[PDB]
Design an enzyme around this catalytic site. Structure first.
Site, PDB file in Angstrom:
ATOM      1  N   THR A  44       0.833  -1.198   0.000  1.00 53.21           N
ATOM      2  CA  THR A  44       0.000   0.000   0.000  1.00 53.21           C
ATOM      3  C   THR A  44       0.869   1.250   0.000  1.00 53.21           C
ATOM      4  O   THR A  44       0.591   2.214  -0.722  1.00 53.21           O
ATOM      5  CB  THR A  44      -0.933  -0.001   1.214  1.00 53.21           C
ATOM      6  OG1 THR A  44      -1.553  -1.288   1.344  1.00 53.21           O
ATOM      7  CG2 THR A  44      -2.013   1.063   1.057  1.00 53.21           C
ATOM      8  N   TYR A 108     -12.646  -3.607  -2.527  1.00 57.77           N
ATOM      9  CA  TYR A 108     -13.731  -3.169  -3.402  1.00 57.77           C
ATOM     10  C   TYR A 108     -14.800  -4.234  -3.632  1.00 57.77           C
ATOM     11  O   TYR A 108     -15.996  -3.936  -3.537  1.00 57.77           O
ATOM     12  CB  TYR A 108     -13.152  -2.684  -4.738  1.00 57.77           C
ATOM     13  CG  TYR A 108     -14.159  -2.169  -5.742  1.00 57.77           C
ATOM     14  CD1 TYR A 108     -14.959  -1.070  -5.460  1.00 57.77           C
ATOM     15  CD2 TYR A 108     -14.279  -2.763  -6.993  1.00 57.77           C
ATOM     16  CE1 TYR A 108     -15.873  -0.594  -6.390  1.00 57.77           C
ATOM     17  CE2 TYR A 108     -15.182  -2.296  -7.926  1.00 57.77           C
ATOM     18  CZ  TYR A 108     -15.978  -1.213  -7.622  1.00 57.77           C
ATOM     19  OH  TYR A 108     -16.878  -0.752  -8.556  1.00 57.77           O
ATOM     20  N   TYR A 134      -2.788 -10.046   5.188  1.00 57.01           N
ATOM     21  CA  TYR A 134      -2.782  -8.602   5.417  1.00 57.01           C
ATOM     22  C   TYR A 134      -4.229  -8.155   5.592  1.00 57.01           C
ATOM     23  O   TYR A 134      -5.020  -8.219   4.645  1.00 57.01           O
ATOM     24  CB  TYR A 134      -2.098  -7.865   4.259  1.00 57.01           C
ATOM     25  CG  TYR A 134      -2.001  -6.353   4.391  1.00 57.01           C
ATOM     26  CD1 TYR A 134      -2.271  -5.709   5.594  1.00 57.01           C
ATOM     27  CD2 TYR A 134      -1.629  -5.570   3.304  1.00 57.01           C
ATOM     28  CE1 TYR A 134      -2.184  -4.332   5.705  1.00 57.01           C
ATOM     29  CE2 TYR A 134      -1.537  -4.193   3.408  1.00 57.01           C
ATOM     30  CZ  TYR A 134      -1.816  -3.581   4.610  1.00 57.01           C
ATOM     31  OH  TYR A 134      -1.726  -2.213   4.722  1.00 57.01           O
ATOM     32  N   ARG A 139      -9.217   0.210   4.283  1.00 56.48           N
ATOM     33  CA  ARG A 139      -8.822   0.355   2.886  1.00 56.48           C
ATOM     34  C   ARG A 139      -9.510  -0.645   1.965  1.00 56.48           C
ATOM     35  O   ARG A 139      -9.844  -0.304   0.826  1.00 56.48           O
ATOM     36  CB  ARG A 139      -7.302   0.210   2.741  1.00 56.48           C
ATOM     37  CG  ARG A 139      -6.491   1.340   3.353  1.00 56.48           C
ATOM     38  CD  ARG A 139      -6.887   2.682   2.753  1.00 56.48           C
ATOM     39  NE  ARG A 139      -5.908   3.725   3.048  1.00 56.48           N
ATOM     40  CZ  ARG A 139      -4.853   3.989   2.281  1.00 56.48           C
ATOM     41  NH1 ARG A 139      -4.642   3.284   1.178  1.00 56.48           N
ATOM     42  NH2 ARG A 139      -4.005   4.953   2.616  1.00 56.48           N
ATOM     43  N   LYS A 163      -0.756  -9.583   8.886  1.00 57.71           N
ATOM     44  CA  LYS A 163      -0.411  -8.198   9.107  1.00 57.71           C
ATOM     45  C   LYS A 163      -1.709  -7.474   9.412  1.00 57.71           C
ATOM     46  O   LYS A 163      -2.584  -7.260   8.570  1.00 57.71           O
ATOM     47  CB  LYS A 163       0.281  -7.507   7.917  1.00 57.71           C
ATOM     48  CG  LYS A 163       0.382  -6.000   8.048  1.00 57.71           C
ATOM     49  CD  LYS A 163       1.172  -5.454   6.876  1.00 57.71           C
ATOM     50  CE  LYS A 163       1.125  -3.927   6.767  1.00 57.71           C
ATOM     51  NZ  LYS A 163       1.703  -3.410   5.550  1.00 57.71           N
ATOM     52  N   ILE A 204       5.473  -4.309   9.997  1.00 61.25           N
ATOM     53  CA  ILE A 204       5.617  -3.866   8.614  1.00 61.25           C
ATOM     54  C   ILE A 204       5.263  -2.385   8.625  1.00 61.25           C
ATOM     55  O   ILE A 204       4.085  -2.010   8.589  1.00 61.25           O
ATOM     56  CB  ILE A 204       4.744  -4.665   7.641  1.00 61.25           C
ATOM     57  CG1 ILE A 204       5.223  -6.118   7.599  1.00 61.25           C
ATOM     58  CG2 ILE A 204       4.803  -4.063   6.245  1.00 61.25           C
ATOM     59  CD1 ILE A 204       4.379  -7.037   6.741  1.00 61.25           C
TER      60      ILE A 204
HETATM   61  N1  LIG Z   1      -8.724  -6.372 -10.191  1.00 59.08           N
HETATM   62  C1  LIG Z   1      -8.263  -5.050 -10.592  1.00 59.08           C
HETATM   63  C2  LIG Z   1      -8.065  -4.978 -12.110  1.00 59.08           C
HETATM   64  C3  LIG Z   1      -9.355  -4.911 -12.904  1.00 59.08           C
HETATM   65  C4  LIG Z   1      -9.077  -4.765 -14.390  1.00 59.08           C
HETATM   66  C5  LIG Z   1     -10.343  -4.446 -15.161  1.00 59.08           C
HETATM   67  N2  LIG Z   1     -11.393  -5.476 -14.953  1.00 59.08           N
HETATM   68  C6  LIG Z   1      -9.249  -3.978 -10.136  1.00 59.08           C
HETATM   69  O1  LIG Z   1     -10.287  -4.279  -9.543  1.00 59.08           O
HETATM   70  O2  LIG Z   1      -9.025  -2.787 -10.344  1.00 59.08           O
END
Ligand SMILES: N[C@@H](CCCC[NH3+])C(=O)O
Ligand SMILES: N[C@@H](CCCC[NH3+])C(=O)O
Lengths: 295, 296
Positions: A44, A108, A134, A139, A163, A204
């Site tokens: 990161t 995400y 980790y 984040r 971590k 770390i």
């Molecule tokens: N896994 C990465 C790369 C994605 C590439 C486009 N599908 C992300 O979520 O950004």
């Protein structure tokens, strides 16, 4: 088969939009020369999200080649929110001399606990080198539960610890009370000593980029149970540990490295950018209170 | 400003034998078009954009713009990324390949500052000439596009025309439209579609519309016609399914529902996403019974 001790989440210095590979090797040497036990390339702190695949691979190679003949181990940053990408990074890091891999929890997409187990099992089954989990929910948006962490430690022979960057000392107690054989690594500079004093075996660090000798002394005082010395350094480092996060890491630490003359240009990759002019002065003000080692 | 509003669907990406089922994908878009949907969002969060390769991400955009061609259904292509250069590349592809606009999620994991968010979207808006709809979902990205940053981007960039809010903060929704009533606020939260629309929101980008596109479209269109009685009624009827579609992380429940409804062949995810738990598999199945699921 572990990678423990004082470790540094290396920043990735840029120059004219390109990875400054000469400064990158020079910064790693500076870490080696001040008692650092391992380096984490492309974390990161290393701006892993904006590096290309060729740059991610290059920073790993520079770390492995610089640490040859030294004990700084290379816990290569190999995390991804796509399991096949994380397996590919794990496979590359092994085949290019990395001692282990640091694999961040998927961001995400917020996988479930079952998905996190299968995610890390596929990573762990693809290589025969140590894999350190980790956890940083602020984040990633997801949390590797204590039960999932303990299962991965017991089911996968190369998964040896986690971590933790969650600011939850209760979870640190929960991990080591129910599974004392894992290696808990502090991913939060401000609470390095509390994590180490409860049985953690390494850090770390972000602050170790600027003050590797102080982080190294702290970690090793703690590992020898010299908690009077370990706490003293941890208390003295609190102001810099907090000001290095007045904006999102690694914006403050790279600004400090520039202010310390350790990197040539204060260059980030968007959406990361330079800090505010107020925070620019605050970081410089806090730096004036610490002994910054040169090259 | 060129706008893309109305009822929109965050399309799931069905897999079969580890590959994108393209025939099924285009069949799902036709089903959306045939149930009053105004736009489709390929390769969103619901579309498992994180695990799709670059070729698969581009392919799903191409199929969406091709399936909708000859209709007024627009393609708001998912083009977000936590790397500005990656997001600019996705925006330029969507432009050169027929997309009506782009959906650009706030950068995840790297947590940019408010200044960094502005420069990120400014570079995206200056790289393309199609409308750009912001996407705010702090629970997934770890960052929040503040009201001040959204309004600055709306006023400084021609292509930035609104935001997809997935933050569960109706207070923020009032803040956006009270200070900038010309923006297009889009609901990214199915359970509160009507409250966002009743305060001036102009559309939805839905997860539930994958399973019940006729109900999401009718809800959105009742609200745009200021028929708040019927819009709320459908929003209340849909609450049980709107919440059970998030008993686990999207798009795990919705793909389970699409599989249980026979709309896709295999209940296939790409790791780290996987099938739901046994109990949640039964819970999704029970809630589906209380709704009329349209066929093909
Ligand atoms: N896994 C990465 C790369 C994605 C590439 C486009 N599908 C992300 O979520 O950004
Ligand atoms: N946007 C991608 C880029 C990955 C490049 C390699 N670390 C991600 O953060 O997952």
């Amino acid at each position: 088969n572990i990678i423990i001790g004082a470790m540094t989440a290396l920043i990735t210095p840029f120059k004219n939009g390109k990875v400054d590979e000469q400064s990158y090797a020079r910064l790693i040497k500076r870490q080696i020369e001040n008692g650092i036990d391992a380096v984490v390339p492309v974390g990161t702190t290393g701006e892993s999200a904006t590096l290309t695949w060729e740059e991610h691979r290059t920073c790993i190679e520079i770390a492995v080649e610089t640490c040859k003949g030294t004990k700084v181990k290379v816990l290569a940053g190999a995390g991804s929110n796509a399991t096949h990408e994380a397996v590919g990074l794990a496979k590359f890091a092994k085949e290019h001399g990395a001692d282990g891999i640091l694999s961040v929890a998927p961001y995400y997409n917020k996988p479930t606990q079952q998905g996190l187990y299968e995610h890390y099992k596929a990573i762990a089954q693809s290589v025969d080198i140590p894999v350190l989990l980790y956890n940083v929910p602020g984040r990633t948006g997801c949390e590797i539960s204590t039960d999932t962490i303990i299962k991965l430690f017991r089911d996968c022979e190369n998964i040896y610890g986690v971590k933790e960057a969650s600011g939850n000392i209760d979870k640190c107690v929960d991990l080591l009370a129910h599974e004392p054989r894992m290696m808990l690594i502090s991913g939060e500079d401000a609470i390095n000593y509390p994590i180490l004093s409860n049985g953690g075996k390494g850090v770390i660090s972000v602050t170790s980029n600027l003050l590797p000798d102080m982080i190294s002394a702290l970690t090793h005082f703690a590992l020898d149970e010299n908690y009077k010395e370990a706490k003293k350094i941890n208390d003295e480092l609190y102001n810099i540990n907090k000001i290095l996060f007045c904006e999102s890491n690694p914006i403050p630490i790279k600004t400090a490295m520039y202010l310390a003359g350790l990197i040539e240009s204060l260059e980030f990759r968007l959406p990361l950018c330079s800090p505010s002019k107020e925070n620019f002065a605050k970081i410089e003000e806090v730096m004036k209170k610490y002994k910054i080692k040169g090259f």
